[PDB]
């Protein structure tokens, strides 16, 4: 019964918000990532890193406000407050993009803290730790996208900035420069997310329409008791229904709920891998066979060659404002354009 054990006691008390040992990492870091994002979006500009306004103070609304990435010139600098870039000056630190590293790193340690909490609470309660395991998928996306991707690039400048329209911009960048929609790892992600949403909706709907009549009321919610031993819907009728509508159905509730874990988690992991490739401009940009034929045969046209024309438009039209440090000057006559437009 020493101090360590006394603190364990106190951390693990059953209270409205459980603390745990993981709370020591989670809570400060989660609160600081979120404070940094609300602080930056309210007050802080992107003028010096990006030539953009990005805060409510400047006239931005909820969609356009962002905590923007540091200037490309900062490389992959940690941009510590006390570091040689900002030399302790909090004002300069904001103006140089320090809040982006602040948010990203405190955010990274918070996700760790959060998944530690999932492990901690599951051990204390005596459940298997599959919810923690599932949470590995959001971690993978976060690190690959916000950390790995810009680390393979020239700077943090090219990571996503923390904001609604700034993320939209990130999406469009990845189409035009990486042709990310063509990437089978994104496609596997798409099918995991869409497959997830489908499973979510189809499983909720099935339970609600194979219910057992357990209460007298038109409102079927009242007739469930959290401690009842009985399944509250018929798996048998659900199974016959889906077998006759769709041909196959689930017959094993355990497989079903595992598959629900499996689909979206795997989807996310696959997309993380592909972003890791893009860290290196290692893209699924082209099909070589298509380019060779099309170079030689100017009547050959597919949706594949149509979409690269659009990526070419995107790059040339957005690059100068989206990468100001490159001092891209594209005179009117070099801009790719179709007829009339």
């Amino acid at each position: 019964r020493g101090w360590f054990d006394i603190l364990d006691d106190w951390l693990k008390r059953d209270r409205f918000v459980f603390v745990g040992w993981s709370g020591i990492l989670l809570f400060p870091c989660a609160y600081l990532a979120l404070g940094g994002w609300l602080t930056g979006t309210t007050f802080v500009t992107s003028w010096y890193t990006h030539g953009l306004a990005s805060s409510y103070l400047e006239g931005c609304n909820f969609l356009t406000v962002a905590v923007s990435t540091p200037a490309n010139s900062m490389g992959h600098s940690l941009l510590l407050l006390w570091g040689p870039e900002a030399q302790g000056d909090f004002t300069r630190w904001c103006q140089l993009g320090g809040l982006w590293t602040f948010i990203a790193l405190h955010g990274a340690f918070g996700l760790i803290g959060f998944m530690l909490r999932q492990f901690e609470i599951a051990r204390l309660v005596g459940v298997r730790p599959y919810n923690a395991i599932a949470f590995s998928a959001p971690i993978a996306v976060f690190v690959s996208v916000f950390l790995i991707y810009p680390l393979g690039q020239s700077s943090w400048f090219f990571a996503p900035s923390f904001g609604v329209a700034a993320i939209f911009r990130f999406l469009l960048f990845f189409q035009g420069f990486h042709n990310w929609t063509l990437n089978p790892f994104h496609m596997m992600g798409v099918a995991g997310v869409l497959g997830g949403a489908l499973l979510c909706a189809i499983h909720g709907a099935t339970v609600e329409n194979t219910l057992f009549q357990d209460g007298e009321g038109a409102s079927t919610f009242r007739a469930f008791n959290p401690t009842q031993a009985e399944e509250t819907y018929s798996m048998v009728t659900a199974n016959r229904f889906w077998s006759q509508i769709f041909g196959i159905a689930f017959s094993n509730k355990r497989w079903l709920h595992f598959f629900m874990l499996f689909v979206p988690v795997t989807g996310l992991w696959m997309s993380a891998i592909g972003v890791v490739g893009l860290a290196l401009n290692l893209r699924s940009y082209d099909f070589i066979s298509q380019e060779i034929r099309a170079a030689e045969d100017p009547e050959f046209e597919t949706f594949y060659t149509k979409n690269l024309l659009l990526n070419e438009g995107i790059r040339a039209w957005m690059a100068p404002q989206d990468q100001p440090h490159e001092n891209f000057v594209f005179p009117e006559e070099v801009l790719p354009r179709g007829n009339a437009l």
């Binding site: 070589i288 066979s289 298509q290 060779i292 034929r293």
Partner: protein
Amino acid sequence: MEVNQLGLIATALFVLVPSVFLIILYVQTESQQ
């Protein structure tokens, strides 16, 4: 189309090797029960 020749053997094997593996485990499961 000027397509990578090894795509064919790669697709074939990518398909055949894992499938044969599955079949092997299935048929020997059925012969138990």
